[PDB]
A paper describes a structure:
The genome of E. coli encodes three L-asparaginases, called type I, II, and isoaspartyl aminopeptidase/L-asparaginase, respectively.
Three structures included in this report, referred to as EcAIID90T/K162T-L-Asn50, EcAIID90T/K162T-L-Asn56, and EcAIID90T/K162T-L-Asn62, were determined for crystals of the EcAIID90T,K162T variant grown in the presence of 10 mM L-Asn at pH 5, 5.6 and 6.2, respectively. All three structures, refined at the resolution of 2.15 Å or higher, are isomorphous and belong to the space group P3121 with two protomers, representing half of the biological assembly, present in the asymmetric unit. Therefore, we will describe only the structure of EcAIID90T/K162T-L-Asn50. Somewhat unexpectedly, we found that in all three structures one of two independent active sites (in protomer B) was occupied by a citrate anion, despite the fact that L-Asn was present in the crystallization buffer, which is illustrated in Fig. S2c.
Author numbering:
A (entry chain A), B (entry chain A): -1 to 15, 31 to 326
C (entry chain B), D (entry chain B): 1 to 15, 31 to 326
Write the structure that this text describes.
């Protein structure tokens, strides 16, 4: 009886005490796995972009058979977006686990070391397979679809705000009581292996007396899709509504989501989606709805079919 | 011993079973107060705008001495924004209480009737004075600064997510254990009595691979101020950052807030605000930071002084 | 249209029990509803006999109906739901519902809650998910569901693992199902039982008396659940009484007064050494339900621990 | 630089008690720190004698220092904090701190928590806010603070009314202060007491035994707090025992096992008729603290109710 082989892919700086030398910062890692590190890119998470996403997904798909699991170290600001992109595009059913740190590795009571430890525990556990892309933060295993950051600074910020966590980790053991029902990874039709770019999808915000200029600027630039961060149950300020209604009639894909941090933007409730050709995002927040819309646009431009995609993934 | 006189100002449709005839939908109101209703405007809350705000504040300031308290019925989508605008601009220290309903007045288990009842209870209670503008929803008394909507459909959606509620209502009695520390109402310098318009402030969203076109569109239109809904602790995608940095150097006021639903966007932590001339929003979310920025711009265009305003109100 | 049976255990939650279709006419559009009053008791006085009656009724009537809705007061809903979750062998939907506001109150919650419970019981997708609680537009599993606030209409939450689904306009978006075994996958069978093992609960706090625990032991209780402090720790005096009782054959489960999170095995207390069982995410009242049932099968602590790891 | 005294009640929370400035060197930049070991006990074994000792020490040493930080285990922190909140007469900051992870663990929380507690005790703005608990970058009042999760570093929350302030980079943004009276505005004075009235807690649940409650009554306890179901309701057998005890002069407080919300007076139980007291937002363990103190002044239920409405 030997240890699993886990690869750590880094996207940025170190979250505990180079990527080569993590087994020296956290020597406890040796007792759980044989670890190898690769620096895939080196960027701040706030600057995350489509090229990095494509690079990551291709790397995991290509190296899937060379390792028992993956841990990806990633900044916290856009973790939730990269996790969902990977959840839809990775075709490997071995564990893929993302992890970060809310405090810098040099600060007192840095969270990164224990988070990294727990991420490797999770990647090494056979029970973690077939659950989609996972985020491990603060002793908790979270699915890539529902996970979001709820507080600007709290070490406990990452939560699955609509449907809850998959499991909790205590003393290196995971109690899994849930798995996601929406389709992920190998069960999706999305395949990015041949793609060098993704459809252009932007996000506009709604609020009192909202300007329509952001929306117009995107339409005039020929964006493929626009996600509205609506008020309440995905409602839109009138000027924004008028702009997006005309955009949707002339070929732009329009998804109604919500600025409100929990709950679904429901179909045909507040706005007659069938009349305008809009798609309702359900529980996906604006930034995650963008991810799914970009992918849906690689397969179809028909709002009816896009809506079905939002109801399945 | 007689009952207080409470005025109900409506901004839209009825939240229980015209505004004239509310005492017939909720006859229990008669036992608590002598009620008078006025329809101030009639618009959907998603279409809320600066003109309505100015109208409301002027009406309350003008009628303050004619009544013992005010209840304003308002749609839920933008309640949080109107509440904070009033919290900063009303000069009456009698109770001003906003209320709405998450379910339509015709549906089974409509929440509006009991919410309206409780709002009048709150407006009638002497202990409610001097606490700023209040929101009463779901048996809870919430301050206009911290209150926000947390779920798209839940009757329990309104919460003061950073500092908690002021009081709870049980059987027509309020247990107040808190009052807001930030300055409000009569203690602010903001005076809208002479104003027919407010400075133009827009909001842009950050996310992976964020377009700078929304921000550029606002700058090119000559907006007075721009609020960034940043990632994490108010961070900005690089293209957005570059656009806003140049805007701030050339006279546009720029406030960093966060798309993350709780916690403060803190000063000089993630971004060197002093170098770029940016202002950090603290706990104010993007839509509320817009409210304060619009008002601050009536007094000053200097980022240092704007920052002090964000630290006091 | 499906045939749905409403079993009442107390008062009416909208506007007795065949009145319901008159109080909530909209029910006729979604199901053919029949009602029976099984008992008439306050939820605060809920007891083992009512539990046995309910489970036998459902098990016996399973073939005659397409789903069950049980009307139940809110105070102890979470206990009954878990009991039924472990003992019901019908795989048709069983849905519990109640109301936080009286049916005569302004903005009473019971009518819409009842409507949504019937919706849930009528949906094919609800089957095989265990016993469910439907409150405030949300569908919750009977194991994790608990009341979090004394008065709020939104009180019912699955505080460790989340809800199964949300209901909007009569349609349910299910994204979860419980992994722990339930209903027809458990070994527990109450069909021939007229009583259950005696299990009590003691609370821990600063300067706690051991007298409650001693009282239960002297009365020959079969098991004792401790509502511990933090991660299931015990006040010294209480610990000593329970350690002794475990040696003489009383089953002892460490749970926590803390409202979320697991009481984990062998972390704060050497469970193997004293013959204690750790409750996991089960709060004290739920841990009682499982221990009662466990004790119908075994008195061995290691086997009871295994049960607490599977159900 | 302010002079801050660290009073320890148990183990060390970073890397005994004069070591602290060596374990957390950054403390030297913000205060002149002195440490004293007051007792050395596990938090789960916290008791009335430790409480009396702590309050007398602070009251006696108030003039010699600019603020106090008390190091305390997490299990019962919420009880000690409320006791001190009612009995301390020093108006200088008193700040409690602990750690959810052992000081030797990876990513131990105690060092930064200790640093933030000293920061808080050193800030002028912290005075006159009552006794405070500083955990996970947040400043919480001793009345409302409770532990919400068995293991999470973020467990401590003021679940009904929220935190007072948040700490970022050594600065505190205070937006709240507690309205209920505390510290030097209470009538409670423990300076001449060597013991406290005897108050125990019983739990309610389905089929609850009255034996715990009877045991406390037979031992002549001065008061009993009920952890009720829902809005402080009681299982029938328990109710009957407590109704009898209240008539013979035992003080009885109805609280709730439900983790948030008030137990409200005369709503679910006719408190006036039975001579019971409703706890408001005080959970059972906190309601014990107040009832113990109330009973040093009066045995009359109407006066005890007034106390529960003011403190």
């Amino acid at each position: 009886h030997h240890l699993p082989n886990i690869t750590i892919l880094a996207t940025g700086g170190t979250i505990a005490g180079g990527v080569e030398n993590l087994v020296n910062a956290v020597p406890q890692l040796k007792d759980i796995a044989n670890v190898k590190g690769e620096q895939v890119v080196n960027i701040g998470s706030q600057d995350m972009n489509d090229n990095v996403w494509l690079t990551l997904a291709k790397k995991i798909n290509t190296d899937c058979d060379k390792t028992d699991g993956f841990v990806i170290t990633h900044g916290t600001t856009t973790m939730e977006e990269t996790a969902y992109f990977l959840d839809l595009t990775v075709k490997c059913d071995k564990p893929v686990v993302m992890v970060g740190a809310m405090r810098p590795s040099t600060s007192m009571s840095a969270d990164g070391p224990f988070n990294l430890y727990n991420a490797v525990v999770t990647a090494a556990d056979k029970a973690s397979a077939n659950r989609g892309v996972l985020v491990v933060m603060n002793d908790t295993v979270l699915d890539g679809r529902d996970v979001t950051t709820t507080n600007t600074t709290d070490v406990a910020t990452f939560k699955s705000v609509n449907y809850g966590p998959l499991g909790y980790i205590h003393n290196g053991k995971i109690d899994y009581q849930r798995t996601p029902a929406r389709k992920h990874t190998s069960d999706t039709p999305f395949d990015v292996s041949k793609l060098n770019e993704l459809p252009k999808v932007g996000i506009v915000y709604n609020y009192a007396n909202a300007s329509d200029l952001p929306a117009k600027a995107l339409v005039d630039a020929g964006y493929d899709g626009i996600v509205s961060a609506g008020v309440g149950n995905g409602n839109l300020y009138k000027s924004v509504f008028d702009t997006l209604a005309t955009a949707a009639k002339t070929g732009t894909a329009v998804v109604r989501s919500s600025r409100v941090p929990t709950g679904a933007t429901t179909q045909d409730a507040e706005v007659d989606d069938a009349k305008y050709g809009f798609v309702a995002s359900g529980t996906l927040n604006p930034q995650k709805a963008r991810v799914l819309l970009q992918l849906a646009l690689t397969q179809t431009k028909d709002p009816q079919q896009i809506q079905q995609i939002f109801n399945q993934y």
